[PDB]
């Protein structure tokens, strides 16, 4: 129940980078997933490759003790994996080591205790097969939603860090399929597409906050989770994206203020795929990707460095609820 404000600010920081990268593409990612893969990796990281990472996740190293950050993730993950019987929510962490590779014992015991991480051994010499293992781990974990996480695995790969998050919830107030008509969606000034629009006339936790120049809708799921939607006013999207902070979200989440309204929410099936190296570099995480990296906390056998940082996420929204999955793939190789 904390370190949360840092995760929230991390979500917005990364979002602004992905948005700057492209303003004409859908965006879907999971902060918790990206954040824990990197947090877990900082465990076997030293000096400044270490600080860049943790500060890159929006942590003030002089205000919160390093041990407490990891205790925060440990508790965060434990809570996420104990949801109300009505909500489905799971996460998993996995270390994929190559045969031999003598790992520092402290690193292994830390990822095990602080991140509840699993650990496997594999021969990266047989690329197609090792790639097969990692991908099945993620596939089984995300219940089939993500099946092709790793498309390319390096032959000299010494170790891989992988995690996944799976979510499935039912709306507290479902929509009626028979009410789903097809309506217009204005992508922009020149393009308009037709999509299945869900409709419901009723009581909603909705309101028009002039601080964000947009309507804000909150839709609870059965259990411990909520979906928040922000509809910016004409020409105000950029304003909304820059005015979002953790404090603001916190405010909406405390009041159940309801009211009558006619709502039109489209069904969705979007996917996000990313190579986070440059976007993360823009957030101050660059050393762990270069020869100036220090992963001597992971192993002493060889001088390792991060080769890839891949993220994938999929979303599905219909009249029953939402279904989502995200995954992270971190590959390390010798300098």
């Amino acid at each position: 129940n904390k370190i949360t404000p840092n995760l929230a600010e991390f979500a917005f920081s990364l979002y602004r980078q992905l948005a700057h990268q492209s303003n004409s593409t859908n965006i879907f990612f999971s902060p918790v997933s990206i954040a824990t893969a990197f947090a877990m990796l900082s465990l076997g990281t030293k000096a400044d490759t270490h600080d860049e990472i943790l500060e890159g996740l929006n942590f003030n190293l002089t205000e919160i003790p390093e041990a407490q950050i990891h205790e925060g993730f440990q508790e965060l993950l434990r809570t996420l994996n104990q949801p109300d019987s009505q909500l489905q929510l799971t996460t998993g962490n996995g270390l994929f080591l190559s045969e031999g590779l003598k790992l520092v014992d402290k690193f292994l015991e830390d990822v095990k205790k602080l991140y509840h991480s699993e650990a496997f051994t594999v021969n990266f010499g047989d690329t197609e097969e090792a790639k097969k293992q990692i991908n099945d781990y993620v596939e089984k974990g995300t219940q089939g939603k993500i099946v092709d996480l790793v498309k390319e695995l390096d032959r000299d790969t010494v170790f891989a860090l992988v995690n996944y998050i799976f979510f499935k919830g039912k709306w507290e107030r479902p929509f009626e399929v028979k009410d789903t008509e097809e309506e217009d969606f204005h992508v922009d000034q020149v393009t308009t597409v037709k999509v299945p629009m869900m409709k419901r006339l009723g009581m909603f936790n909705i309101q028009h906050c002039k601080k964000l120049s947009s309507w804000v809708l909150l839709m609870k799921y059965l259990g411990n989770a909520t979906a928040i939607f922000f509809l910016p006013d004409e020409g105000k999207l950029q304003h909304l994206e820059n005015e979002l902070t953790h404090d603001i979200i916190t405010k909406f989440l405390e009041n159940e203020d309801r009211r009558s309204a006619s709502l039109h929410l489209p069904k969705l099936s979007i996917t996000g795929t990313y190579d986070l190296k440059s976007v993360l570099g823009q957030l101050g995480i660059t050393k762990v990707f270069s020869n100036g990296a220090d992963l001597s906390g992971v192993t002493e056998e060889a001088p390792l460095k991060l080769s890839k940082a891949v993220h994938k996420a999929v979303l599905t929204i219909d009249e029953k609820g939402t279904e989502a999955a995200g995954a992270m793939f971190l590959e390390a190789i010798p300098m």
């Binding site: 593409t25 918790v32 204005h186 999509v195 309204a261 099936s269």
Partner: protein, 36 residues
């Protein structure tokens, strides 16, 4: 009108939040529901 008619028929932002921890599980921006 009354009741207000709120239509998500143009680009919008959204956040998936877990209630106990208050942490952001997922975040996104829909620009074209059919992009593919």
């Amino acid at each position: 009108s009354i009741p207000p008619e709120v239509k998500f028929n143009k680009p919008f932002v959204f956040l998936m939040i877990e209630q106990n921890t208050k942490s952001p599980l997922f975040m996104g921006k829909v620009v074209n529901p059919t992009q593919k």
